[PDB]
C-alpha cells in the first residue's frame, strides 16, 4: 500500500518505516525535524531495504498535506508526528495543543480534501486517566489525562471519533501505546533524545554509557511489590510490527478500531534497572528520590483484543529491550550525526 507516515523520522516512526518497507509498502515520510535528524533516513532505507520518499514539512500546513496526499496517491496515513514531553506540556500547553490537536486536525482535513480515508493514530494509555482498574481494557470509558499532553491525545481520539461518525467510510485505528523502549536489533537505529531524557530506559542508558551519574528512582513507597512504579514496557520493534498489521488488516474496514498495544504485563523500575545492569555488564548506578508529580503507581495493558482481532502479540522480552537499547547506545553514543 502507499502510506504517508508523519513523524516517520522519529523514534517509533523510523522503526515502523523499516518494517513497512520490509513488507514492500511504498513509504512517504513527512517530518518537520523538530525532534529528529535527516541522518536517520539513509539508515531507514538500508535497514528497510527499500527507498522511502522524504518530505520535510509540518502537519499543520494543510495545503502541503493535501498536496502530498494527492501527489503520492496515498491509501493510508500513519500519524506519529506531534510533541510528547509531558513536563514541557505543563509548561507550554499551547504548543502541545497546536501541534497535536490542531496538527492532527489540519492533517485529517487534508485527507478529506484528497479523499484519503484510512488512518492510524499514535495514542496513549494516558487516555485512560486515573483508572484504579488494571489492566486497562479498551472497553473502559476514558478518564481525565493529567497533562496537556495527555489531554491533547484524548481530544484527538474524540475528534477522530466524531469524524468517523460523519464520514462512515473511514477506517481509523486508535493505537494506545504503553511504554515504548528498545531499538532495532542491528544497533544502528534507536531512540535519540536531545538533552535530558524524560523516560526511564534512555535515562538508564545514559547513566550506563557514563553520561550521567545516577538514576533517580522517582518514588519507592508505592503500593507495589518492590515500592517502585510498575509499567508495561514494549519493544519498539513489536510496536512497529503492530502498526504494519493494523494498517494491513484495517484498511478499508470502516470503523474506529481501538487497540491497546502493550506486552500485557507490568515491570517495576527496579526490574528494568536490573535488566539493564545485566545487559551492559555493570551495575547501573541509582538512588531513590521523591515521587514525580502526576505519576501513577502501577498499570499495564490488557492486550487480548489485539491478539484476538489482529492476531498480534509482542514477541520481544524485557531483556531484549534492554540489550537492544544498550547496543545502540553503545554503538552510537552521539546518536545520529548532524
Ligand X SMILES: NC(=O)c1ccc[n+]([C@@H]2O[C@H](COP(=O)([O-])OP(=O)(O)OC[C@H]3O[C@@H](n4cnc5c(N)ncnc54)[C@H](O)[C@@H]3O)[C@@H](O)[C@H]2O)c1
Ligand Y SMILES: O=c1ccn([C@@H]2O[C@H](COP(=O)(O)OP(=O)(O)O[C@H]3O[C@H](CO)[C@H](F)[C@H](O)[C@H]3O)[C@@H](O)[C@H]2O)c(=O)[nH]1
Q: Which amino acids are annotated catalytic?
A: 149
**17 is annotated as contributing to ligand binding:** no
Residue 254 interacts with Na ion (CB under 5 A): yes or no: no
Among residues 308, 326, 306, the alpha carbon closest in space to that of 318 is found at 326
Ordered DSSP codes for 252-301: T--EEEEEEES-SS-EEHHHHHHHHHHHHTSPPPEEEEPPPTT--SB--B
Say which residues have a Cβ less than 8 Å from residue 306's Cβ, sequence separation at least 6.
242, 259, 260, 261, 312, 313
3-state DSSP helix/strand/coil percent for the chain, to nearest 5? 40, 20, 40
Chosen from ligand X, ligand Y, a second copy, none, partner binding at 33 (C-beta under 5 to 8 Å by type): ligand X
Q: Which residue has the cell 551495575?
A: 283
Residue 4 or residue 204: which is nearer to ligand Y going by CB?
Answer: 204
What is the end-to-end Cα distance of the chain in Å, rounded? 32
Residue 33 or residue 216: which is nearer to ligand X going by CB?
Answer: 33
Binding interface with ligand X (CB under 6 A): 6-7, 9-13, 31-36, 58-60, 80-84, 99, 103, 122, 124, 177, 180, 199
- Whole-angstrom CA distances from 232 to 2, 74, 124 are 32, 33, 12
Q: Are 193 and 247 in contact (CB under 8 A)?
A: no
**199 is annotated as contributing to ligand binding:** yes
Among residues 324, 3, 7, the alpha carbon closest in space to that of 185 is found at 324
Cis peptide before 144 (omega within 30 of 0): no
* Residue of the chain from 42, 49, 130, 158 that contacts a second copy (CB under 8 A): 158
Residue 120 interacts with ligand Y (CB under 6 A): yes or no: no
Residue 140 is classified by DSSP as S
**23 is annotated as contributing to ligand binding:** no
* Residue of the chain from 22, 23, 61, 102 that contacts a second copy (CB under 8 A): 102
Kindly indicate which of the ranges 68-76, 122-130, 161-169, 269-277 contains the residues binding Na ion, using the contact rule CB under 5 A. 161-169
Residue 158 or residue 317: which is nearer to a second copy going by CB?
Answer: 158
Residue 311 interacts with Na ion (CB under 5 A): yes or no: no
Chosen from Na ion, ligand X, a second copy, none, partner binding at 10 (C-beta under 5 to 8 Å by type): ligand X
Residue 162 interacts with a second copy (CB under 8 A): yes or no: yes
* Residue of the chain from 115, 139, 194, 311 that contacts Na ion (CB under 5 A): 194
Kindly indicate which of the ranges 21-29, 153-161, 163-171, 249-257 contains the residues binding Na ion, using the contact rule CB under 5 A. 163-171
Contacts 24+ apart (CB under 8 A), 194-203: 194/35, 198/85, 198/86, 198/87, 200/269, 200/272, 201/233, 201/272, 201/276, 201/321, 201/322, 201/325, 202/325, 202/329
* Residue of the chain from 15, 79, 184, 231 that contacts ligand Y (CB under 6 A): 231
Give the footprint of ligand Y on residues 184-203 (CB under 6 A). Answer: 198-200, 203
Q: Are 219 and 295 in contact (CB under 8 A)?
A: yes
Report in angstroms how near the CB of residue 114 gets to a second copy at its nearest: 14
Report in angstroms how near the CB of residue 297 gets to ligand Y at its nearest: 8
230-231 vs 267-268, strand pairing mode: antiparallel
Whole-number Å distance between alpha carbons of 206 and 222: 25
Return residues touching a second copy (CB under 8 A): 90-94, 97-98, 101-102, 105, 108-109, 112, 148, 151, 155, 158-159, 162-163, 165-166
Binding residues for substrate: 124, 149, 179, 199-200, 216-218, 231, 292-295, 299
Binding residues for NAD(+): 11-12, 31-36, 58-59, 80-84, 99, 124, 149, 153, 178
Return residues touching ligand Y (CB under 6 A): 86, 124-126, 147, 150, 179, 198-200, 203, 215-219, 229, 231, 269, 292, 294-295
Amino acid at each position: 500500500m502507499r502510506v504517508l507516515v508523519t513523524g516517520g523520522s522519529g523514534y517509533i516512526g523510523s522503526h515502523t518505516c523499516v518494517q513497512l518497507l520490509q513488507n514492500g509498502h511504498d513509504v512517504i515520510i513527512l517530518d518537520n525535524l523538530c525532534n529528529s535528524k535527516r541522518s536517520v533516513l539513509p539508515v531507514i532505507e538500508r535497514l528497510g531495504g527499500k527507498h522511502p520518499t522524504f518530505v520535510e514539512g509540518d502537519i499543520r500546513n494543510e495545503a502541503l498535506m493535501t498536496e502530498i496526499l494527492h501527489d503520492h496517491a496515498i491509501d493510508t496515513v500513519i500519524h506519529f508526528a506531534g510533541l510528547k514531553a509531558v513536563g514541557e506540556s505543563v509548561q507550554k500547553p499551547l504548543e502541545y495543543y497546536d501541534n497535536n490537536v490542531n496538527g492532527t486536525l489540519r492533517l485529517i482535513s487534508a485527507m478529506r480534501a484528497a479523499n484519503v480515508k484510512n488512518f492510524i493514530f499514535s495514542s496513549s494509555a494516558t487516555v485512560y486517566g486515573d483508572n484504579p482498574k488494571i489492566p486497562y481494557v479498551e472497553s473502559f470509558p476514558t478518564g481525565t489525562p493529567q497533562s496537556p499532553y495527555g489531554k491533547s491525545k484524548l481530544m484527538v481520539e474524540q475528534i477522530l471519533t466524531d469524524l468517523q461518525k460523519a464520514q462512515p467510510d473511514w477506517s481509523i485505528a486508535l493505537l494506545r501505546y504503553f511504554n515504548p523502549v528498545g531499538a532495532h536489533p542491528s544497533g544502528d537505529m534507536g531512540e535519540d533524545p536531545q538533552g535530558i531524557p524524560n523516560n526511564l530506559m534512555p535515562y538508564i542508558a545514559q547513566v550506563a554509557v557514563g553520561r550521567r551519574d545516577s538514576l533517580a528512582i522517582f518514588g519507592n513507597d508505592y503500593p507495589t511489590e518492590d515500592g517502585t512504579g510498575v509499567r508495561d514496557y514494549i519493544h519498539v520493534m513489536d510496536l512497529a510490527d503492530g502498526h504494519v498489521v493494523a494498517m494491513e488488516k484495517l484498511a478499508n474496514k470502516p470503523g474506529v478500531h481501538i487497540y491497546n498495544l502493550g506486552a500485557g504485563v507490568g515491570n517495576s523500575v527496579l526490574d528494568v534497572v536490573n535488566a539493564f545492569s545485566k545487559a551492559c555488564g555493570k551495575p547501573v548506578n541509582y538512588h531513590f528520590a521523591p515521587r514525580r508529580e502526576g505519576d501513577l503507581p502501577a498499570y499495564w495493558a490488557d492486550a487480548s483484543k489485539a491478539d484476538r482481532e489482529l492476531n498480534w502479540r509482542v514477541t520481544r522480552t524485557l531483556d531484549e529491550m534492554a540489550q537492544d537499547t544498550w547496543h545502540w547506545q553503545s554503538r552510537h553514543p552521539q546518536g545520529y550525526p548532524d
